[PDB]
A paper describes a structure:
We next analysed rods that interconnect vertices in the right-handed direction. Surprisingly, in addition to the CTD appendages, a second region of ill-defined extra density was present near the Sec31 dimerisation region. Upon classification we could divide the right-handed rod dataset into two classes, both of which converged to resolutions between 13 and 15 Å. Analysis of the averages placed in the context of individual tomograms shows that the extra rods are sparsely and randomly distributed. We also discover a second interaction within the outer coat: in addition to the known interaction of Sec31 β-propellers with each other at vertices, these domains can also bind to the Sec31 dimerisation interface, at the centre of the α-solenoid region. This leads to extra outer coat rods creating a bridge between canonical rods. Occasionally these extra rods form a canonical vertex interaction at one end, and an orthogonal interaction with other rods at the other end. Such rods ‘glue’ mismatched patches of outer coat lattice together: they might therefore be important for outer coat stabilisation in a context of flexibility and adaptability. Due to limited particle numbers, the resolution we obtained does not allow us to precisely define the residues involved in the interaction between the β-propeller and the α-solenoid domains of Sec31.
COPII mediates Endoplasmic Reticulum to Golgi trafficking of thousands of cargoes. ER export is mediated by the coat protein complex II (COPII), which minimally comprises five cytosolic proteins that form two concentric layers on the ER membrane—the inner and outer coat. The inner coat layer consists of the small GTPase Sar1 and the heterodimeric Sec23/24 complex, whilst the outer coat layer comprises the rod-shaped heterotetramer Sec13/31. Here we visualise the complete, membrane-assembled COPII coat by cryo-electron tomography and subtomogram averaging, revealing the full network of interactions within and between coat layers.
Author numbering:
A (entry chain B): 2 to 157, 170 to 292
B (entry chain F): 2 to 157, 169 to 292
C (entry chain C): 378 to 469, 493 to 690, 694 to 745
D (entry chain A): 378 to 469, 495 to 690, 694 to 745
Amino acid sequence: VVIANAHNELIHDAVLDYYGKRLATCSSDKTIKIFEVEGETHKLIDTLTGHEGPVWRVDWAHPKFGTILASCSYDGKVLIWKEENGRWSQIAVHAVHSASVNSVQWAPHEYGPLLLVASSDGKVSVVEFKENGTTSPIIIDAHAIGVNSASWAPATSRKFVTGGADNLVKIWKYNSDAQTYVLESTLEGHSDWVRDVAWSPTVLLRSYLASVSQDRTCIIWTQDNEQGPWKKTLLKEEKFPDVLWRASWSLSGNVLALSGGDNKVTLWKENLEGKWEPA
Amino acid sequence: VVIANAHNEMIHDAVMDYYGKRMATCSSDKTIKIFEVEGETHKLIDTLTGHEGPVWRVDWAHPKFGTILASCSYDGKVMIWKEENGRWSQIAVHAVHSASVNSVQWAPHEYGPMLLVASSDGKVSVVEFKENGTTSPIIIDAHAIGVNSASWAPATESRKFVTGGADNLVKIWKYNSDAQTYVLESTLEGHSDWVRDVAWSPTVLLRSYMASVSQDRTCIIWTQDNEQGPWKKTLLKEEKFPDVLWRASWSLSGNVLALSGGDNKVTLWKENLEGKWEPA
Amino acid sequence: GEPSPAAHWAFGGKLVQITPDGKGVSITNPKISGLESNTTLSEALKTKDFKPLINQRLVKVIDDVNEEDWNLLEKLSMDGTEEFLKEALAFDQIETNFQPEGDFSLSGNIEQTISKNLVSGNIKSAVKNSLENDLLMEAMVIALDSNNERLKESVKNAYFAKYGSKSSLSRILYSISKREVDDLVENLDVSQWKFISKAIQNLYPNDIAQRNEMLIKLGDRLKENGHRQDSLTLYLAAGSLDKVASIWLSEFPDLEDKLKKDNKTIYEAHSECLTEFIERFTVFSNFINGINNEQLIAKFLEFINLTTSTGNFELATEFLNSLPSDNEEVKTEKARVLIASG
Amino acid sequence: GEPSPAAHWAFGGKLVQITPDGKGVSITNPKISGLESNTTLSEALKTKDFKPLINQRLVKVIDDVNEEDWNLLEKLSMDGTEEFLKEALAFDETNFQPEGDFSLSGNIEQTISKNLVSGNIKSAVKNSLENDLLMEAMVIALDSNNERLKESVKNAYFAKYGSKSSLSRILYSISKREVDDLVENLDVSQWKFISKAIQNLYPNDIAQRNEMLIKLGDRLKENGHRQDSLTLYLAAGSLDKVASIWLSEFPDLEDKLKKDNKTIYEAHSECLTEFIERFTVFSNFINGINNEQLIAKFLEFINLTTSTGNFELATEFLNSLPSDNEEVKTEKARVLIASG
């Protein structure tokens, strides 16, 4: 199934929603597009407008809140969108960062309608939408140089991993006696900017993290339990041909989808040894 | 049950039918009388006549041949008369003997319509009455001077009867198909004078009993047991009865002695456990 | 022509003789010591009250057996046949707690197969196995729960087949169960006769013929086994005058021999024995339920003769009328008496 | 702004990426070696012929026990439920002639004999029991109609024998129309018997018939008769008992698989599948959701199925779950839109 020419400017993100039927894209044209794919057909449904700069990413929210989509852009802001009564409209706007926002992600539906945001300004913001609408977020300084990604850990006590341009990967946990997310662990292992970080939703004892970097390597970080440390495990002994840009875990099977710069997508799974191989 | 003055002349015999309902008296008046006896009543029917001399004895025949009564008289004749239709008639007249006939008894019906006649003519006759009227007589001499009795012996040949002598001798006679007539058997002596009467018993018990009365004024009961066995002479008493002895009669059963004397008294006798005799 | 009483005896015990005046005739019925007209019997037989006769006979009885006899007659005359038979045939919950406890199990091919028949609802075969194996109570406890008959009895016949010869009680049970009494009548101890008797009564309450046939059978045994007095009891209850006539007709000769020794003449012996034989019989014959016996007839005819000689033509006629008018002797005799008395 | 596929995974096991031209979106369902939609199950669940499915599990079974269950199902497949429970619950002198004299010896005999003849059948038995003449007491009673008497002896036999003889104790129960005793104390080895005593005493009262059959199954399974307790359950129509047993046996089963050179996922995956196919085929022959864990694990198989893209087989199991459970609710809705 292919939807050629969804945009005329280069596209940076395409995400299907909770039912994996409703597509959504974003690119330099500074717009988002909603699609409806079936067998091998497709129908545009709208074009979201507002961002003053190329749009970097989008994330669909859990259906239990409505039909929402979040986006972030080089313009250093985040826009939420809604499809009420049959038409999309900018409900809220989040802009507390002073540089390009590169990632945005809806927390687990159990936490409510929270949003995880990371920016080149080095900070990360956590945002909920009050009873009235406005937003009173959490802002933390999380990386030097710039933050490129941030992902939520599955639900139990709330944790999320960030990936900065300081080559570091970082786990965060919420604390009461601070009313903020505090730095739980710093994981060193990349020699160049970390482009993305994905926390696997696998519900097994062991937790899985996958970080991708400008150094042409993918690292799977794992933690057996609370007393265990985060163990480093290169996805493969040899570096890759080009820069790895994204990492995505399936919802089941704990299968990793790696997006390279040689515009190639490799798939991996774990084996008896604890080493990865092509799935 | 007295029948006062039945005759004019002295009476010589009082005998009854087998059913003691009708009697028969005979006397010197040469006449016999038939009677009916009930409770104490005495109806006089006919009076038998045709006898020239005094009637001596009479005897009722067995009902088996109807009503018949035989009489014997001094006239040397015995006569029998039947009673067809309630009216007495003379059926037959037997007169073979030459002189008085003093006894006449009938034979046990078994034997038949037989009559045993004993005359003082010394002989005795046996006569049975055939059909047409003419009988076949049988006579045989039995005693010296004469004959006074002729009782019979019960049925058992084997036909026996005792005779009483005018010559003091008692005898036993048994038929004999080979002799054609009754021949002598015993000859029991015992009396010093004449044998007035002798009667034979019907008592079938183990031993035979015979009575003998005589002018010798004594009774000699002759008891014998079997063929061999001799007759045992037995004095009815070791004394003399004041007068003669005329008749001896045997009771039907219980075997008791009826001894009609001459002193005009009748005496009864029985044989106590030992074998002797006593009154009753 | 010499005077003389010219006597002669004559039928009926009558004596004839010429009167002293020699012109009349006398006819009387002489007195013979020891020879009287049986008045008590005449009365008794007329009244139907034998109390007087029973007592006269009871006062001078001969041997003991006879005494027991008249003694029997005595009681029989007071209490009456029925009340005598009632008094002569008369005789002198538990633990249930079981609670099943603990674990158990079937062991052996036997215990295991019977149960397979029970649950399999195959009660028929369960009984058979219990039997082919010596598990008797078992088969019983089982059949005692079914309402099948041909089966309910197969268990019974098995019980008899091996215990009946080993237990008297078992054997009794056999006959009852099989509704019979032959065995008890024929082999049970003659000492428990009251039990057999009673048993016969309970099996043939509506079959008086059978009952009497059995009571007489039992009767014979008692007699043949030194139980004379009891045999008379069962015979009485069975209304069998024949049997009592035989017991009595046979014990006759001896009876007349003991009287002979009592210093009695041949006539004295014969006479008393006969009269007493006849009295005892006429009496007993009154409380029973009844003349064909040949021997019996000849004695009645013997009693008749002694009777007519006492002059009692009436009593004589009574007896002649109890004999089969088909006997030309009884026939002839009737004639004689008739003519003689009427 | 650099160019990149920007790959993502989405429900149904779909992969979204950007074409090299940088202007197109491409959704697909990648082939993950090891993961395959369950056809056999989908096709057998419709054609209700698990011959193939059963033949598959049988030919690739795991431990010995597992083999019995599939065999139990392999044969249950051909013969059918009814015919199966059949082959599974079944099994592998007169006369006497009296002779000669005899006599009532003793008081006992005489008293009882008199009773009899005197038509007093009742006393005869009393006098019998009050002596060790039980055999006789029984013989007399086996002749009358009087029930209370015709029974006063049974209770007298058992009274002193039902404890010294297993067959006596069994009779005691057959007599008094009961099974409680056998069902709870008769040796488990003779179960095929306690089995017939239930079908025999309660042939027209199913609720009770099954309450007892169950009471036994529990006893078997708890005393080494696993395979058999299942047979009894299969006849009592208690899928719940069979389910519970199988849910407890689950762990150890997933462990024997994990030692067999399989990743934590291959094991977990393979296990839940075998259990679900084993439970489905079994629930298809018995007379039978309210068990939490079962539900819980039902939901689990749903997700593994949706991830295969086989939304149809997923809905089928969704239906069978109580539409009272919210998780069941939510997934019901999600699967709908995802497929519709």
